[PDB]
Short mmCIF file of C-alpha atoms (C1' of nucleotides) in Angstrom, two decimals:
data_model
loop_
_atom_site.label_atom_id
_atom_site.label_comp_id
_atom_site.label_asym_id
_atom_site.label_seq_id
_atom_site.Cartn_x
_atom_site.Cartn_y
_atom_site.Cartn_z
CA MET A 221 -124.78 -44.39 37.51
CA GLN A 222 -127.24 -41.11 35.61
CA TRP A 223 -125.77 -38.60 34.43
CA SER A 224 -127.12 -37.58 37.58
CA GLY A 225 -122.59 -37.76 39.42
CA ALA A 226 -120.16 -39.49 37.25
CA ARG A 227 -117.68 -40.33 39.79
CA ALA A 228 -121.80 -42.65 40.31
CA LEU A 229 -120.78 -44.33 37.47
CA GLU A 230 -117.26 -45.08 37.88
CA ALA A 231 -119.20 -46.05 41.37
CA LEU A 232 -121.61 -49.01 39.36
CA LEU A 233 -119.13 -49.98 36.80
CA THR A 234 -116.65 -51.09 39.16
CA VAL A 235 -119.58 -52.62 40.84
CA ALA A 236 -120.28 -54.63 37.88
CA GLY A 237 -116.36 -55.45 37.28
CA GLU A 238 -116.68 -57.32 40.93
CA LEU A 239 -119.61 -59.47 40.04
CA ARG A 240 -116.86 -60.94 36.94
CA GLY A 241 -115.37 -62.12 39.86
CA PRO A 242 -115.84 -65.42 42.02
CA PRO A 243 -118.80 -65.80 43.73
CA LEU A 244 -121.38 -65.36 40.54
CA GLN A 245 -118.83 -64.93 37.58
CA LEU A 246 -120.99 -63.16 35.83
CA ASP A 247 -120.44 -62.66 32.06
CA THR A 248 -121.01 -58.95 30.00
CA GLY A 249 -124.19 -60.66 28.66
CA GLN A 250 -125.22 -61.37 31.64
CA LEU A 251 -124.75 -58.06 33.28
CA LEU A 252 -126.57 -56.34 30.05
CA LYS A 253 -129.40 -58.43 31.10
CA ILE A 254 -129.64 -57.44 34.38
CA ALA A 255 -128.38 -54.10 33.85
CA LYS A 256 -131.47 -53.39 30.89
CA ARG A 257 -134.25 -54.75 32.97
CA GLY A 258 -133.81 -54.79 36.46
CA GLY A 259 -132.12 -51.32 36.15
CA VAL A 260 -129.16 -49.61 38.92
CA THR A 261 -130.80 -51.35 41.96
CA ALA A 262 -131.09 -54.43 40.83
CA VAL A 263 -126.98 -54.20 39.99
CA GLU A 264 -126.37 -53.31 43.49
CA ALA A 265 -128.24 -55.39 44.43
CA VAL A 266 -126.91 -58.42 43.55
CA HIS A 267 -123.62 -57.28 44.16
CA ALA A 268 -124.72 -56.50 47.85
CA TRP A 269 -125.82 -59.76 48.23
CA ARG A 270 -123.78 -62.03 45.74
CA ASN A 271 -122.88 -64.20 48.90
CA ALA A 272 -126.08 -64.39 50.81
CA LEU A 273 -127.70 -65.73 47.39
CA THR A 274 -125.10 -68.50 46.68
CA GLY A 275 -124.80 -70.50 49.90
CA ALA A 276 -126.74 -69.84 53.13
CA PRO A 277 -129.60 -72.47 52.70
CA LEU A 278 -130.50 -70.57 49.55
CA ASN A 279 -127.52 -72.46 47.35
CA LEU A 280 -128.36 -70.74 44.08
CA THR A 281 -126.41 -70.89 40.49
CA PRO A 282 -125.57 -67.49 39.18
CA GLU A 283 -127.90 -67.85 36.72
CA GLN A 284 -131.12 -68.59 39.05
CA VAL A 285 -129.57 -65.17 40.35
CA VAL A 286 -129.12 -62.98 36.97
CA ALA A 287 -132.55 -64.87 35.78
CA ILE A 288 -134.56 -63.15 39.18
CA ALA A 289 -132.52 -59.71 39.13
CA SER A 290 -133.34 -58.88 35.38
CA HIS A 291 -137.23 -57.26 35.93
CA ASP A 292 -137.89 -54.41 36.99
CA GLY A 293 -138.23 -54.44 41.06
CA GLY A 294 -135.88 -57.30 41.24
CA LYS A 295 -134.04 -55.62 43.89
CA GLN A 296 -136.70 -56.82 45.56
CA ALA A 297 -137.27 -60.56 44.47
CA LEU A 298 -133.58 -60.84 45.18
CA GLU A 299 -134.36 -59.73 49.03
CA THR A 300 -137.69 -61.73 49.37
CA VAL A 301 -135.98 -65.12 47.39
CA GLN A 302 -133.87 -64.59 50.32
CA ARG A 303 -136.39 -64.53 53.19
CA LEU A 304 -138.99 -66.99 52.05
CA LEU A 305 -137.30 -69.49 49.66
CA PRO A 306 -136.17 -72.05 52.67
CA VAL A 307 -139.92 -72.10 54.29
CA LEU A 308 -141.17 -72.35 50.60
CA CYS A 309 -138.72 -75.19 49.79
CA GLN A 310 -139.49 -76.78 53.28
CA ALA A 311 -143.16 -76.32 54.24
CA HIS A 312 -144.77 -75.64 51.05
CA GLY A 313 -143.10 -78.72 49.23
CA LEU A 314 -141.13 -76.66 46.47
CA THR A 315 -138.25 -76.47 44.80
CA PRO A 316 -136.03 -74.15 44.05
CA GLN A 317 -136.71 -73.91 40.35
CA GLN A 318 -140.11 -73.14 41.62
CA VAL A 319 -139.51 -70.53 44.17
CA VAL A 320 -136.79 -68.97 41.68
CA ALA A 321 -139.37 -69.60 38.57
CA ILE A 322 -141.99 -67.80 40.65
CA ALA A 323 -139.80 -65.35 41.76
CA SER A 324 -138.02 -64.20 38.19
CA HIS A 325 -141.06 -62.15 37.27
CA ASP A 326 -141.85 -58.02 37.68
CA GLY A 327 -143.15 -57.59 40.79
CA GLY A 328 -141.39 -61.08 42.31
CA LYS A 329 -141.72 -60.32 45.85
CA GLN A 330 -146.14 -59.56 45.84
CA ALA A 331 -145.94 -63.00 44.05
CA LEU A 332 -143.94 -65.10 46.41
CA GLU A 333 -145.85 -63.16 49.39
CA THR A 334 -148.81 -63.98 47.49
CA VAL A 335 -147.54 -67.85 46.48
CA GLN A 336 -146.60 -67.97 50.88
CA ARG A 337 -149.86 -66.61 51.51
CA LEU A 338 -152.77 -68.62 49.33
CA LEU A 339 -151.03 -71.73 47.85
CA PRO A 340 -152.43 -73.86 51.26
CA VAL A 341 -155.98 -72.99 50.50
CA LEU A 342 -156.01 -72.68 47.11
CA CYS A 343 -154.49 -77.35 47.31
CA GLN A 344 -156.88 -77.06 50.38
CA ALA A 345 -160.03 -75.79 49.87
CA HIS A 346 -159.76 -75.52 45.84
CA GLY A 347 -158.22 -78.30 44.94
CA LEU A 348 -155.25 -77.12 43.09
CA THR A 349 -152.02 -79.07 43.06
CA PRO A 350 -148.63 -76.52 43.44
CA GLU A 351 -147.78 -77.60 40.04
CA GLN A 352 -150.84 -75.51 38.92
CA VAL A 353 -150.41 -72.96 42.05
CA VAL A 354 -146.66 -71.88 40.63
CA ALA A 355 -147.93 -71.66 37.05
CA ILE A 356 -150.69 -69.25 38.00
CA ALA A 357 -148.12 -67.44 40.78
CA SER A 358 -144.98 -67.47 37.53
CA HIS A 359 -146.03 -64.59 35.79
CA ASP A 360 -145.86 -60.88 36.28
CA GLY A 361 -148.69 -59.78 38.70
CA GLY A 362 -149.01 -63.24 39.60
CA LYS A 363 -150.37 -61.68 42.97
CA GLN A 364 -153.31 -60.83 41.54
CA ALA A 365 -153.94 -64.01 39.61
CA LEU A 366 -153.84 -65.90 42.35
CA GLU A 367 -155.84 -63.99 44.59
CA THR A 368 -158.58 -63.58 41.46
CA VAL A 369 -158.54 -67.44 41.35
CA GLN A 370 -158.85 -67.97 44.92
CA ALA A 371 -161.57 -65.09 43.90
CA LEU A 372 -163.45 -66.41 41.30
CA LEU A 373 -162.38 -70.43 41.12
CA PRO A 374 -165.98 -71.62 42.43
CA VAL A 375 -167.77 -69.63 40.70
CA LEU A 376 -166.57 -70.10 37.49
CA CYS A 377 -166.74 -74.20 37.93
CA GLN A 378 -170.10 -73.77 39.35
CA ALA A 379 -171.88 -71.11 36.96
CA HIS A 380 -169.94 -71.20 33.86
CA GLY A 381 -169.63 -74.59 34.26
CA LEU A 382 -165.00 -74.43 33.49
CA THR A 383 -162.77 -77.15 34.92
CA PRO A 384 -160.17 -76.23 37.58
CA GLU A 385 -157.68 -76.68 34.77
CA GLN A 386 -159.54 -74.17 32.31
CA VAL A 387 -159.19 -71.76 35.16
CA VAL A 388 -155.69 -72.10 35.78
CA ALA A 389 -155.27 -72.19 32.60
CA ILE A 390 -157.13 -68.11 32.34
CA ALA A 391 -155.14 -67.85 35.30
CA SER A 392 -151.56 -68.98 33.75
CA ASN A 393 -150.75 -65.85 32.15
CA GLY A 394 -149.81 -62.34 31.94
CA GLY A 395 -152.95 -60.43 32.77
CA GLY A 396 -154.25 -63.70 33.85
CA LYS A 397 -156.96 -61.43 36.88
CA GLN A 398 -157.91 -59.30 34.12
CA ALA A 399 -158.46 -62.37 31.70
CA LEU A 400 -160.57 -64.17 34.33
CA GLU A 401 -162.71 -61.66 35.23
CA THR A 402 -163.04 -60.66 31.66
CA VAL A 403 -164.14 -64.84 31.26
CA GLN A 404 -166.55 -64.45 34.13
CA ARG A 405 -168.64 -60.97 32.49
CA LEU A 406 -168.23 -62.17 28.78
CA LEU A 407 -168.80 -66.07 28.70
CA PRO A 408 -172.41 -66.36 28.89
CA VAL A 409 -172.82 -63.33 25.89
CA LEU A 410 -170.37 -65.20 24.45
CA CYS A 411 -171.81 -68.63 24.00
CA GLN A 412 -175.87 -67.62 24.07
CA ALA A 413 -175.46 -64.70 21.83
CA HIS A 414 -172.33 -65.11 19.24
CA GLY A 415 -172.64 -69.28 19.87
CA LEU A 416 -169.34 -70.49 20.63
CA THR A 417 -168.72 -73.14 22.85
CA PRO A 418 -167.01 -72.71 26.66
CA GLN A 419 -163.86 -73.95 25.21
CA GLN A 420 -163.48 -72.21 22.95
CA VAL A 421 -163.73 -69.18 25.35
CA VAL A 422 -161.26 -70.73 27.39
CA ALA A 423 -158.47 -70.94 24.21
CA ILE A 424 -159.30 -67.16 23.48
CA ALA A 425 -158.76 -66.23 26.89
CA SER A 426 -155.88 -68.64 27.78
CA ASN A 427 -152.80 -66.39 26.54
CA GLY A 428 -151.68 -63.26 27.31
CA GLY A 429 -154.07 -60.32 26.18
CA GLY A 430 -157.16 -62.62 26.56
CA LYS A 431 -159.39 -59.78 27.55
CA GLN A 432 -158.62 -57.95 24.99
CA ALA A 433 -159.21 -60.71 22.61
CA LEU A 434 -162.26 -61.99 24.15
CA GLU A 435 -163.71 -57.86 24.24
CA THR A 436 -162.42 -57.44 20.76
CA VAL A 437 -164.48 -60.92 19.58
CA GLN A 438 -167.45 -59.94 20.78
CA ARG A 439 -167.35 -56.27 19.44
CA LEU A 440 -166.28 -57.70 16.42
CA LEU A 441 -167.37 -61.12 15.57
CA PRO A 442 -170.42 -60.21 14.59
CA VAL A 443 -168.64 -57.51 11.80
CA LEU A 444 -165.68 -60.23 10.64
CA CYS A 445 -169.10 -62.79 10.31
CA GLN A 446 -172.22 -61.12 8.45
CA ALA A 447 -169.86 -58.60 6.49
CA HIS A 448 -166.25 -60.42 5.94
CA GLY A 449 -167.67 -64.21 5.24
CA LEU A 450 -165.34 -65.94 8.03
CA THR A 451 -166.83 -68.83 10.17
CA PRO A 452 -167.20 -68.10 13.90
CA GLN A 453 -164.89 -70.96 14.16
CA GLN A 454 -162.24 -69.11 12.20
CA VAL A 455 -162.67 -65.63 14.35
CA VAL A 456 -161.96 -68.27 17.61
CA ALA A 457 -158.83 -69.33 15.44
CA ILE A 458 -157.55 -65.53 14.88
CA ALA A 459 -158.36 -64.22 18.19
CA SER A 460 -157.03 -67.13 20.19
CA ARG A 461 -154.14 -66.92 18.04
CA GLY A 462 -153.30 -63.80 17.18
CA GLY A 463 -156.07 -61.53 19.51
CA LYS A 464 -157.55 -58.14 19.95
CA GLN A 465 -154.20 -56.59 17.51
CA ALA A 466 -155.30 -59.96 14.92
CA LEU A 467 -158.69 -59.42 15.13
CA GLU A 468 -158.81 -56.25 13.86
CA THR A 469 -156.09 -56.06 11.21
CA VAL A 470 -158.07 -58.70 9.69
CA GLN A 471 -161.20 -56.45 10.08
CA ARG A 472 -159.42 -54.12 7.45
CA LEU A 473 -157.20 -55.68 5.22
CA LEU A 474 -158.94 -58.88 4.90
CA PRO A 475 -160.87 -57.28 1.73
CA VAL A 476 -157.41 -55.93 0.19
CA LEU A 477 -155.48 -58.73 0.84
CA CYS A 478 -158.34 -61.00 -0.82
CA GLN A 479 -159.18 -57.98 -3.76
CA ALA A 480 -156.15 -57.10 -4.87
CA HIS A 481 -154.26 -59.26 -4.08
CA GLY A 482 -155.62 -62.23 -4.78
CA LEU A 483 -155.28 -64.52 -1.44
CA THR A 484 -158.38 -66.47 -0.29
CA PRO A 485 -159.86 -65.51 3.32
CA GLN A 486 -158.45 -68.95 4.37
CA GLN A 487 -154.83 -67.85 3.43
CA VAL A 488 -155.48 -64.30 5.59
CA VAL A 489 -156.95 -66.28 8.64
CA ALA A 490 -154.25 -68.42 8.65
CA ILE A 491 -151.29 -65.51 8.58
CA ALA A 492 -153.52 -64.05 10.83
CA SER A 493 -153.73 -66.98 13.28
CA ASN A 494 -150.50 -66.54 14.70
CA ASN A 495 -148.86 -64.11 17.69
CA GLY A 496 -148.19 -61.12 15.91
CA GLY A 497 -150.47 -61.91 12.84
CA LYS A 498 -151.05 -57.99 12.69
CA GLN A 499 -147.60 -57.86 12.04
CA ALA A 500 -147.46 -60.83 9.57
CA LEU A 501 -150.46 -59.12 7.80
CA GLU A 502 -149.24 -55.88 7.41
CA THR A 503 -146.16 -57.49 6.57
CA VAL A 504 -147.43 -59.33 3.58
CA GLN A 505 -149.48 -55.99 1.61
CA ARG A 506 -145.90 -54.34 1.30
CA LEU A 507 -143.97 -57.27 0.05
CA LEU A 508 -145.69 -60.34 -1.58
CA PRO A 509 -145.43 -58.42 -4.89
CA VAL A 510 -141.74 -57.60 -4.55
CA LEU A 511 -141.31 -61.25 -3.26
CA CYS A 512 -143.16 -62.94 -6.18
CA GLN A 513 -142.05 -60.08 -8.69
CA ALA A 514 -138.81 -59.88 -7.44
CA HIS A 515 -138.24 -63.06 -5.91
CA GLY A 516 -140.15 -65.07 -8.17
CA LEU A 517 -141.93 -66.90 -5.43
CA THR A 518 -145.83 -68.19 -5.32
CA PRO A 519 -148.05 -66.19 -3.20
CA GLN A 520 -148.59 -69.91 -1.62
CA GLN A 521 -144.76 -69.80 -0.29
CA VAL A 522 -145.18 -66.31 1.21
CA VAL A 523 -148.45 -67.30 2.69
CA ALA A 524 -146.69 -70.25 4.12
CA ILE A 525 -143.85 -68.07 4.94
CA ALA A 526 -145.86 -66.11 7.45
CA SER A 527 -148.29 -68.28 8.49
CA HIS A 528 -145.92 -68.36 11.90
CA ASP A 529 -145.57 -66.55 14.60
CA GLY A 530 -142.64 -64.00 13.59
CA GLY A 531 -143.91 -64.35 10.28
CA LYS A 532 -142.71 -60.38 10.01
CA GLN A 533 -139.34 -61.06 10.74
CA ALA A 534 -139.60 -64.50 8.53
CA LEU A 535 -140.68 -62.66 5.10
CA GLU A 536 -138.01 -59.85 5.85
CA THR A 537 -135.59 -61.80 6.36
CA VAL A 538 -136.51 -63.66 3.40
CA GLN A 539 -136.22 -60.68 1.41
CA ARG A 540 -133.05 -59.66 3.06
CA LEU A 541 -131.49 -62.94 2.58
CA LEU A 542 -132.55 -64.91 -0.19
CA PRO A 543 -130.46 -63.28 -3.26
CA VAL A 544 -127.18 -63.58 -1.15
CA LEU A 545 -128.02 -67.74 -0.02
CA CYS A 546 -129.04 -68.76 -3.34
CA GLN A 547 -126.48 -66.58 -5.46
CA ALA A 548 -123.71 -67.06 -3.04
CA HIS A 549 -124.46 -70.61 -1.29
CA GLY A 550 -126.09 -72.27 -3.79
CA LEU A 551 -128.89 -73.21 -2.13
CA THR A 552 -132.79 -72.89 -3.92
CA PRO A 553 -134.99 -70.67 -2.87
CA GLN A 554 -137.70 -74.13 -2.06
CA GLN A 555 -134.94 -75.06 0.54
CA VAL A 556 -134.59 -71.11 2.19
CA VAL A 557 -138.50 -71.30 1.90
CA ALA A 558 -138.39 -74.03 4.08
CA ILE A 559 -135.75 -72.61 6.29
CA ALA A 560 -138.36 -69.44 6.87
CA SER A 561 -141.53 -71.30 7.61
CA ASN A 562 -141.29 -72.49 11.06
CA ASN A 563 -141.19 -70.10 14.02
CA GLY A 564 -138.14 -68.52 14.22
CA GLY A 565 -137.57 -69.13 10.71
CA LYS A 566 -135.25 -65.44 10.55
CA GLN A 567 -132.77 -66.83 13.37
CA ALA A 568 -132.95 -69.99 10.76
CA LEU A 569 -132.17 -68.04 7.21
CA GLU A 570 -129.65 -66.00 9.45
CA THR A 571 -127.74 -68.72 11.16
CA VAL A 572 -127.56 -70.81 8.47
CA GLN A 573 -126.46 -67.75 6.51
CA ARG A 574 -123.27 -67.93 8.92
CA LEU A 575 -122.71 -71.18 9.45
CA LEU A 576 -123.59 -73.21 6.78
CA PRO A 577 -119.92 -72.91 5.49
CA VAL A 578 -118.51 -73.65 9.35
CA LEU A 579 -120.60 -76.79 9.27
CA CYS A 580 -119.61 -78.60 6.27
CA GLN A 581 -116.08 -76.95 6.82
CA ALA A 582 -114.57 -77.60 10.00
CA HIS A 583 -117.16 -81.15 10.72
CA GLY A 584 -117.66 -82.44 7.17
CA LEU A 585 -121.53 -81.65 6.69
CA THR A 586 -123.33 -81.22 3.56
CA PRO A 587 -125.29 -78.40 2.11
CA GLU A 588 -128.05 -80.91 2.36
CA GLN A 589 -127.52 -82.02 5.98
CA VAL A 590 -127.31 -77.76 7.29
CA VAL A 591 -130.20 -77.62 5.41
CA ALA A 592 -132.59 -80.37 6.63
CA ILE A 593 -131.32 -78.91 10.42
CA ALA A 594 -131.75 -75.40 9.93
CA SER A 595 -135.77 -76.33 8.51
CA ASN A 596 -137.86 -76.48 11.53
CA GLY A 597 -138.51 -74.95 14.37
CA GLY A 598 -135.99 -73.92 16.75
CA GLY A 599 -133.16 -73.90 13.58
CA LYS A 600 -130.39 -71.61 15.52
CA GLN A 601 -130.68 -73.88 18.24
CA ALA A 602 -130.54 -76.73 16.44
CA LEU A 603 -127.27 -76.42 13.99
CA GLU A 604 -125.34 -73.87 17.00
CA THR A 605 -125.83 -77.48 18.91
CA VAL A 606 -124.75 -79.25 16.59
CA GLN A 607 -121.78 -77.68 16.17
CA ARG A 608 -120.54 -78.16 20.07
CA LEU A 609 -121.60 -81.11 20.34
CA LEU A 610 -120.90 -82.82 17.47
CA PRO A 611 -117.13 -83.61 18.20
CA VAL A 612 -117.92 -85.38 21.84
CA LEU A 613 -121.17 -86.96 20.21
CA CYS A 614 -118.54 -88.99 17.92
CA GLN A 615 -115.56 -89.14 19.26
CA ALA A 616 -116.56 -90.27 23.04
CA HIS A 617 -120.00 -91.66 22.27
CA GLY A 618 -119.47 -93.35 19.25
CA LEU A 619 -122.20 -91.56 16.76
CA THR A 620 -122.02 -91.25 13.23
CA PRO A 621 -122.60 -87.59 11.81
CA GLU A 622 -125.92 -89.23 9.90
CA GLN A 623 -126.44 -90.33 13.76
CA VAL A 624 -125.99 -86.48 15.09
CA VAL A 625 -127.55 -84.93 12.36
CA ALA A 626 -130.99 -87.15 12.54
CA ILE A 627 -131.19 -86.26 16.43
CA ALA A 628 -131.01 -82.38 15.22
CA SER A 629 -133.22 -82.20 12.05
CA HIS A 630 -136.82 -82.57 14.82
CA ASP A 631 -138.25 -79.55 16.52
CA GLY A 632 -135.98 -79.22 19.69
CA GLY A 633 -133.49 -80.81 18.01
CA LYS A 634 -131.29 -78.86 20.60
CA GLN A 635 -132.86 -80.58 23.51
CA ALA A 636 -132.47 -84.09 22.14
CA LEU A 637 -128.67 -84.11 21.36
CA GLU A 638 -128.16 -82.54 24.70
CA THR A 639 -130.17 -85.42 26.76
CA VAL A 640 -128.60 -87.56 24.24
CA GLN A 641 -125.13 -85.99 25.15
CA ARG A 642 -126.47 -86.76 29.32
CA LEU A 643 -128.18 -90.23 28.95
CA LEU A 644 -125.77 -92.24 26.82
CA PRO A 645 -123.65 -93.35 28.87
CA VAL A 646 -126.74 -94.63 31.64
CA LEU A 647 -128.99 -96.33 28.94
CA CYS A 648 -126.07 -98.14 27.18
CA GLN A 649 -123.91 -99.15 30.01
CA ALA A 650 -126.39 -99.59 32.83
CA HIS A 651 -129.71 -100.75 30.70
CA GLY A 652 -128.35 -102.22 27.30
CA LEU A 653 -129.89 -100.00 25.01
CA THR A 654 -127.73 -100.08 22.33
CA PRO A 655 -126.53 -96.75 20.41
CA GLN A 656 -128.98 -97.04 17.38
CA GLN A 657 -132.38 -97.82 20.39
CA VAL A 658 -130.78 -94.02 21.56
CA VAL A 659 -130.98 -92.52 18.49
CA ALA A 660 -133.79 -94.30 17.56
CA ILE A 661 -135.94 -92.33 20.53
CA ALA A 662 -134.25 -88.99 19.84
CA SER A 663 -135.01 -88.95 16.29
CA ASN A 664 -138.54 -87.51 16.65
CA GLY A 665 -140.17 -84.68 18.08
CA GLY A 666 -140.21 -84.86 22.18
CA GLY A 667 -137.29 -86.98 21.62
CA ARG A 668 -135.58 -85.68 25.20
CA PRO A 669 -138.66 -85.85 27.02
CA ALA A 670 -138.79 -89.47 25.33
CA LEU A 671 -135.35 -90.22 26.47
CA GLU A 672 -136.14 -88.56 30.23
CA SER A 673 -138.95 -90.43 30.37
CA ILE A 674 -136.85 -93.83 28.89
CA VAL A 675 -134.36 -93.57 31.80
CA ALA A 676 -136.79 -92.70 34.28
CA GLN A 677 -138.92 -95.72 33.94
CA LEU A 678 -135.26 -97.61 34.11
CA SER A 679 -133.68 -96.09 36.80
CA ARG A 680 -136.84 -96.41 38.77
CA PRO A 681 -139.19 -98.78 37.81
CA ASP A 682 -142.35 -97.91 38.13
CA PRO A 683 -145.43 -99.17 38.93
CA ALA A 684 -146.87 -99.82 35.15
CA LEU A 685 -143.30 -102.27 35.61
CA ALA A 686 -143.59 -105.94 34.14
CA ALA A 687 -143.78 -107.81 30.82
CA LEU A 688 -142.87 -104.33 29.48
CA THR A 689 -138.74 -105.42 28.83
CA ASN A 690 -136.62 -102.56 27.89
CA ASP A 691 -136.99 -103.46 24.22
CA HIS A 692 -141.02 -102.82 24.29
CA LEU A 693 -140.40 -99.61 26.03
CA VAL A 694 -137.57 -98.65 23.40
CA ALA A 695 -140.33 -99.31 20.79
CA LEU A 696 -143.26 -97.31 22.58
CA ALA A 697 -140.51 -94.13 23.25
CA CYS A 698 -140.24 -94.52 19.40
CA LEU A 699 -144.45 -94.75 18.81
CA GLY A 700 -145.32 -91.83 21.11
CA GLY A 701 -142.52 -90.34 23.05
CA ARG A 702 -142.92 -89.69 26.65
CA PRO A 703 -146.44 -89.60 26.12
CA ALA A 704 -147.40 -93.14 25.14
CA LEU A 705 -144.62 -94.16 28.39
CA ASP A 706 -147.09 -92.00 30.55
CA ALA A 707 -149.61 -93.42 28.71
CA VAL A 708 -149.43 -97.12 29.59
CA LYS A 709 -148.10 -95.74 33.53
CA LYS A 710 -151.80 -94.20 33.41
CA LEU A 711 -153.63 -97.80 31.86
CA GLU A 712 -152.20 -100.22 34.57
CA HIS A 713 -152.49 -98.47 37.44
CA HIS A 714 -156.34 -99.02 37.68
CA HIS A 715 -157.09 -101.98 34.98
CA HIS A 716 -154.76 -104.20 36.11
"C1'" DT B 254 -136.27 -44.02 39.38
"C1'" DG B 255 -138.02 -48.32 40.57
"C1'" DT B 256 -142.04 -51.05 40.96
"C1'" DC B 257 -145.87 -53.27 40.28
"C1'" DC B 258 -149.40 -54.73 36.64
"C1'" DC B 259 -150.94 -55.83 31.49
"C1'" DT B 260 -150.47 -56.47 26.42
"C1'" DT B 261 -147.84 -57.54 21.69
"C1'" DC B 262 -144.58 -60.07 19.63
"C1'" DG B 263 -141.64 -63.33 18.80
"C1'" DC B 264 -138.67 -68.18 19.29
"C1'" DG B 265 -138.40 -72.69 20.63
"C1'" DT B 266 -140.11 -77.53 21.95
"C1'" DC B 267 -143.75 -80.81 21.97
"C1'" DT B 268 -148.75 -83.20 21.10
"C1'" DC B 269 -150.54 -85.65 19.02
"C1'" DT B 270 -148.93 -88.92 14.91
"C1'" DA C 131 -144.92 -83.61 7.15
"C1'" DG C 132 -146.93 -80.13 9.77
"C1'" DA C 133 -150.99 -77.68 12.53
"C1'" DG C 134 -151.75 -76.22 16.63
"C1'" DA C 135 -150.26 -76.58 21.37
"C1'" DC C 136 -147.42 -76.45 24.89
"C1'" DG C 137 -143.92 -73.20 27.19
"C1'" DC C 138 -140.23 -68.63 28.16
"C1'" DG C 139 -139.27 -64.74 27.67
"C1'" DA C 140 -137.87 -59.47 25.66
"C1'" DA C 141 -140.15 -55.33 24.86
"C1'" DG C 142 -142.64 -51.67 25.94
"C1'" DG C 143 -146.72 -48.88 28.44
"C1'" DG C 144 -149.60 -46.83 32.08
"C1'" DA C 145 -149.87 -46.03 37.25
"C1'" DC C 146 -148.87 -44.16 41.49
"C1'" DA C 147 -144.18 -43.48 44.77
#
DNA sequence: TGTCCCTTCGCGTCTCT
DNA sequence: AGAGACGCGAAGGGACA
């Protein structure tokens, strides 16, 4: 494979070719993903046990095989899944998808082996659920995090007053060991010395890099408070949402962005408080001028674009694409900003760029409708799913384009559309719901869950039965999705 | 060059409503 | 009408073989 053989390359490439074949039927992107992260041995591993993984008592899908293979040590994870999946399922009551989730990280082997070793004790002696153990286990370094929950859950609960959920939250991220230990070491100082609440410390600690965020908060909270004027609450927001890197970038750019660019603290904070906040801030400091003078955006709009995960990408993309989107497509700035002002804004912009004309042309949609779809989180996904699924939703399922669009114009549009494709048949002709009621369920954020939850209760009439007739359930799902449904399930469990 | 673990960043989805 | 929470994953870095 390496430059360390050229007949060896041919051999590798032949191995990749054969994987396009019957068992897995892999496509180029899937092969790429494996080679990119699992490396050559992962590619070879997959080839070697393609049959074993697809049949036997494993019965994995190719996409599951790809998910497992495409990490450092993928060969090991694949080996270990072949050994442990059956017993994890039969004995520990996990589903294969859960075993795959565990296996699909760097060092999957160790996590799989540690889950087998520890799940029972974590459940019996500590009272965690299998879901919880899986969530702890399904990250790089799962082994470590599992072992550390086993070691510190008692002390964290009894000595420091955390709940198990809290502990699990902390553990269920990459570097969980580190986060838990750091909470153990610093919780007391952060509360008594800097006046934080446990809850806040937990929140700071419950994302990748939490150790770093904690140590940095400990280190920089005083400065940011007593010197730059920020409130603790604000520092916590930066620390929890933007971590260490954001905290440090605020320390160094707050004065510049406020005094030289005229932003308020609240604004700097809002830009900071997101994954990549470091990047966002640095990108508004560059760029804010050219966007306001050469593109005629308000600072408030620039702040809005920056104030999401990937803010930098959105800003850079807006700069690159606002001209061709107003000028050659006929959108206003205000529309462009709206498309840009969500997680993945870069993706939405780019996807509108290439799909506005197709969607209007080959499906009969107005620009205003394409904008409305793109103007939410996951715009790229919503647009693309409307492109695939609009034909079948209209012709087969008898929905209006107006209806399709309504479902797509919410965060999780893709999810809702696909759920609707799946579940309209059964909801209409097995439970007598109208197409309009289904759409109305789907046309909120949380569409998919609300739908899946409604089909569940209908099909397996659950505990909290009786006076909720189908129409009451629909209304209920429309009002508050699955949370409303589960809430009722909850309340009847004891009240009735 | 593979395997394990940790951190930063980016995209997408849902809750809470 | 988002805000901020939820989850998943790519990518890069170090350690150690």
